[PDB]
Ligand binder design. Structure first.
Ligand SMILES: [Mg+2]
Ligand SMILES: [Mg+2]
Ligand SMILES: [Mg+2]
Ligand SMILES: [Mg+2]
Lengths: 138, 173, 132, 129, 33, 101, 328
């Protein structure tokens, strides 16, 4: 029943600089276990739907790295022990995302990133022609 | 008046100006005691759960005030749970708190369902006396404490347990 | 006969925990990795620095808590912060546990130049999975 | 000597809000999770191990701090820090008409004490002639 | 033109966490952090 | 103390190479270009060979950082083959598992 | 361990309530499937062993079935066969043998009265009935059995089932009956598709030895195949490869009655030729009657080729060849 009344105090100063428009934002998460990435996709999709982003999710093909090492510590080169590192992929595309909405979505996504995965963002910012090109100069 | 003081404390980050630990304990000591009798026990219990033990640990006198509120509110079914929380809150071996609980449970006769609950609590209280940490210096069993425990294990269908209590009166004089 | 990270059968009187009861070929099949970080991904750099830091913590935590450590540490690296999860027996008084927690957090943070989190779970004795 | 207090699971309410218990990402605490969860390969005739003293439930990156109840509460508060995409730029064809230059940039996040990735300096500029 | 570029919103780098901190209150059964 | 005297020698060798890395690069540029006069290139060869012997990139030896095994070392983890198996078989390396296919 | 099961039952119900509370669903319909999808989300374990993943189910389903207490406080066994070691199995044998004598006695009385009102109901072939497996039987009697004991019990049922059958016996027998799933090797005929005034065109998928083939066949054209935008003769100079494409069409005597276009990628000349052959066989099932589709299977057209290149073992020259073995 007893709660801290009005414990919210953030400020959002709306300046005069025009916002940056991103044509399309691509997020590619890579990890070792599918289950973590499967849950992470659900978290990203659920948050994206609530913000109204209309995202699409696809799974790029995986790649497997293998290498071979000797077994014993002396001679015996006919017996090998192999190892394998598996990197599973998952891509989340974002379309028609403004700069202001991009900042909050990415930082909210990045802070909740699990320890066993990492991600790369490819932002396709769009803008008009340069002043020299736009303004007629021969 | 206290709610306006407490309401101000919970606004924004004003809670960081409460003071030190002993000041925080003292601030909630006086405030919680006011919550006992000035308000209905139904809302007092809600504040008891929220404030304790998350914010502060109750003092022995504060437990006495809570017991008084229950007695005035005509509710003795919560007494066994209070004793269980008392041990968790560092009041396992408080002589002042033990006497109050034993007197209240055995003050009046109760239906068998409620009497068994007091008997279970009394047995736990009896075990605490057996394993006091003051036995190294001096173990003391109060005269009142032995009497109420013996009386309690009579009406709960524990006549066999009452027989062992008869010999304690002569052993402790 | 393979001998890598195995405990040999000796009657039925030696307790074995879950980690030690599984052969190394069971990794990623029955038991996970004790440490998780980005360094060993496909196209990620900085994998040797993480490995040497990981080994040091295996030797520091084992020596900071003599005898009271239950089994292997679990190291999680999120952002630039380092989380260390441990199982500790009920050996030292709680005053000493908080001293060592405070000592470990400050020393490692100023040594690796990164924030360190130290989370402890206390158990009465070593957890036994087979034999015993 | 010192004894072990009962876990807070017993005192946990039935209808209490979960996200208040876990505000941030934290490791799986057996006392702090009311859910009885068992994992690990079972014995020949037995059941998987309990949630107390189990390392298998500690290695996993938990998602208790991102419960769907918490996700809606988290995201809704963030809706203040946003601005709408202009409605006139609905079709992708119109985007080319009003903005003929698109620029590709990359940012990389990895676990470690350093963020410097030399692959983050590339810039790809594409223009429709 | 039929397109109006909306004005950007500028906030401090720590205000984003305080927005999430508002949603989560203190826990009744939890010991101090 | 490094694990062996050989490891200590490598640290001195790497340290010396770093100090003379830029100076060697500037002089080596003259030698590797055919547009400069041959007389100047002969003088450059004398100067580049007058530098201390340890300040040579080719003399740097890649060992294991734990046991200093001169060979059988994976370049990615900078670990010997024996030590790498010791860490990987216990599950102490993320994403490393026994290969089965 | 009766009480331990009881404790697990009550806390699992309490635990289920907490899981529904945090998931924000209706606790009255928090089914087990919903529990599994909730657990798989909260604890994302990436492990290949399906049994090693986190689980939270009904303790009756998790804990193995336990034997009940066999004696009272005075030590007297409850059942009358407890001193045979295996009370459950022998009691089942005693009851089963008793039913046979009762049937034999009842049949003997019926023969005396000159009445045969029973019929043999053992034949359950259309339902696909099979007897209990030894593992399944051990989980029904809650007791371990042996191969000799299981065979004797099954043979006794056959004697019971071979006699005239009564209503009570059939219920007793049917508890030991199990139904096999549907067995059939017929393929699913893909219905013909019509698109943009195009009539009778079907699509097929084929794969053989790292080579996938996409074949769409039109039933309204002359005899020609266009692979990758070029004529098939140019694309398959080898006579054998062009024989593979003939094989499906020639088997159905429709060499010139279909116009096809193909798109095959990966592999060598023979891998693609085999892949296109497989794709046509599956794509031509739409235009052909069902009886000849069975003929197609008996000729091996519709079955994928499982032969793929093996790996190279570490320590051997090839997949099977080893280095020269010098004895001395
Ligand atoms: Mg040495
Ligand atoms: Mg030369
Ligand atoms: Mg060399
Ligand atoms: Mg060969």
């Amino acid at each position: 029943v007893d709660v801290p009344k009005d414990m919210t105090k953030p400020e959002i100063t709306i300046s005069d600089e025009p916002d940056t428009l991103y044509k399309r934002l691509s997020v590619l998460v890579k990890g070792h276990d599918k289950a973590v990435l499967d849950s992470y996709e659900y978290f990203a999709v659920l948050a994206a739907k609530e913000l109204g982003i209309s995202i699409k999710v696809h799974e790029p093909p995986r790649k497997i790295e293998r290498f071979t090492l000797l077994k014993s510590v002396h001679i015996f080169k006919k017996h090998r022990v192999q190892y394998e590192m598996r990197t599973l992929y998952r891509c989340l595309e974002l379309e028609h995302l403004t700069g202001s909405t991009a900042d909050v979505y990415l930082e909210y996504i990045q802070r909740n990133l699990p320890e066993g995965v990492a991600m790369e963002v490819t932002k396709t910012k769009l803008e008009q022609l340069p002043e020299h090109i736009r303004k007629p100069i021969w | 008046l206290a709610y306006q003081v407490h309401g101000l404390l919970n606004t924004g980050d004003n809670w960081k100006l409460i003071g030190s630990d002993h000041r925080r304990n003292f601030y909630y000591s006086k405030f919680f005691n006011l919550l006992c009798f000035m308000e209905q026990i139904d809302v007092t219990l809600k504040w008891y759960k929220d404030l304790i033990p998350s914010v502060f640990f109750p003092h022995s006198q504060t437990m006495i005030d809570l017991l008084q509120a229950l007695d005035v509110a005509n509710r003795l079914d919560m007494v066994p749970q209070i004793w269980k929380d008392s041990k968790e809150y560092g009041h396992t071996f408080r002589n002042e708190l033990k006497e109050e609980i034993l007197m209240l449970m055995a003050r009046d006769q109760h239906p068998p369902e409620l009497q068994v609950a007091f008997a279970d609590c009394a047995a736990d209280i009896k075990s605490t006396y057996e394993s006091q940490d003051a036995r190294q210096t001096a173990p003391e069993w109060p005269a009142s404490s032995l009497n109420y425990v013996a009386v309690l294990f009579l009406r709960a269908g524990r006549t066999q347990e009452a027989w062992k209590m008869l010999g304690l009166f002569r052993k402790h004089n | 006969k393979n001998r890598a990270a195995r405990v040999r059968v000796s009657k039925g009187d030696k307790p074995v925990t879950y980690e030690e009861a599984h052969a190394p070929h069971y990794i990623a099949h029955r038991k996970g990795w004790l440490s998780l970080h980005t360094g060993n991904l496909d196209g990620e750099d900085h994998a040797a620095e993480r490995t040497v830091e990981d080994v040091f913590l295996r030797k520091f935590m084992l020596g900071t808590f003599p005898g009271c450590l239950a089994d292997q540490l679990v190291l999680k690296r999120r952002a630039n912060q380092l989380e260390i999860c441990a199982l500790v027996l009920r050996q030292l008084p709680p005053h000493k546990f908080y001293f060592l927690v405070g000592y470990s957090e400050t020393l490692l943070s100023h040594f690796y130049k990164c924030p360190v989190h130290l989370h402890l779970q206390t158990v009465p004795s070593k957890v036994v999975y087979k034999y015993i | 000597r010192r004894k072990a207090l009962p876990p807070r699971t017993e005192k946990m309410a039935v209808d209490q809000d979960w996200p208040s218990v876990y505000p941030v990402a934290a490791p799986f605490k057996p006392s702090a999770v009311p859910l009885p969860v068992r994992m690990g390969y079972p014995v020949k005739r037995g059941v998987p191990m309990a949630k107390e003293g189990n390392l298998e439930l500690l290695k996993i990156p938990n998602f208790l701090h991102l419960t769907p109840v918490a996700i809606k509460r988290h995201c809704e508060a963030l809706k203040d820090f946003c601005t709408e995409w202009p409605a006139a730029l609905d079709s992708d064809e119109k985007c080319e008409k009003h903005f003929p230059i698109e620029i590709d940039t990359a940012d990389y996040v990895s676990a470690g004490p350093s963020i410097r990735n030399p692959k983050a300096r590339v810039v790809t500029l594409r223009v429709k002639l | 033109e039929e397109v109006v570029i909306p004005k950007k919103k500028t906030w401090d780098k720590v205000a984003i966490l305080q927005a999430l901190a508002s949603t989560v209150h203190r826990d009744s059964t939890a010991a101090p952090y | 103390y490094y694990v062996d005297w050989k490891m200590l020698r490598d640290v001195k060798r790497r340290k010396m190479a770093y100090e003379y890395a830029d100076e060697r690069l500037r002089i080596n540029s003259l030698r590797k270009n055919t547009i400069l006069p041959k007389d100047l290139q002969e003088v450059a060869d004398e100067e580049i060979a007058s530098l201390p012997r340890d300040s040579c990139p080719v003399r740097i030896r890649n060992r294991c950082v734990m046991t200093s095994r001169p060979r059988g070392v994976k370049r990615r983890w900078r670990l010997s083959r024996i030590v790498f198996r010791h860490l990987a078989d216990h599950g102490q390396l993320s994403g490393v598992q026994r290969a089965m296919w | 361990t009766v009480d331990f099961i009881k404790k697990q039952i009550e806390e699992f119900n309490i635990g289920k309530r907490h899981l529904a509370n945090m998931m924000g669903e209706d606790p009255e319909t928090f089914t087990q499937e919903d529990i599994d999808r909730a657990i798989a989300y909260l604890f994302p374990s990436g492990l290949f062993e399906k049994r090693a993943r986190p689980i939270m189910k009904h303790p009756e389903e998790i804990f193995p079935k336990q034997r009940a207490i066999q004696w009272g406080e005075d030590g007297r066994p409850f059942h009358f066969l407890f001193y045979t070691g295996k009370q459950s199995y022998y009691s089942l044998m005693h009851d089963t043998y008793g039913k046979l004598l009762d049937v034999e006695k009842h049949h003997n009385q019926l023969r005396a009265k000159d009445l045969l009102a029973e019929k043999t109901k053992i034949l359950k072939d259309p339902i696909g009935s099979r007897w209990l497996i030894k593992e399944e039987l051990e989980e029904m009697l809650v007791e371990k059995l042996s191969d000799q004991d299981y065979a004797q019990f099954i043979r006794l049922l056959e004697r019971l089932s071979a006699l005239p059958c009564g209503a009570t016996e059939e219920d007793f027998v049917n508890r030991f009956r199990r139904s096999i799933p549907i067995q059939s090797k017929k393929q699913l005929i893909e219905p013909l598709q019509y698109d943009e005034q195009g009539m009778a065109f079907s699509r097929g998928e084929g794969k053989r030895k790292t080579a996938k083939a996409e074949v769409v066949v039109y039933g309204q054209g002359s005899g020609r195949i266009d692979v990758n935008g070029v004529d098939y003769l140019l694309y398959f100079p080898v006579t054998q490869d062009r024989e593979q494409l003939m094989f499906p069409l020639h088997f159905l005597d429709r060499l010139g009655k279909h116009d096809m276009t193909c798109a095959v990628s990966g592999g060598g000349r023979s891998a693609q030729a085999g892949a296109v052959r497989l794709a046509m066989a599956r794509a031509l099932c739409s235009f052909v009657t069902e009886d000849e589709v069975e003929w197609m299977r008996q000729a091996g057209l519709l079955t994928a080729d499982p032969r793929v290149r093996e790996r190279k073992k570490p320590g051997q020259e090839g997949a099977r060849r080893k280095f020269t073995w010098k004895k001395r």
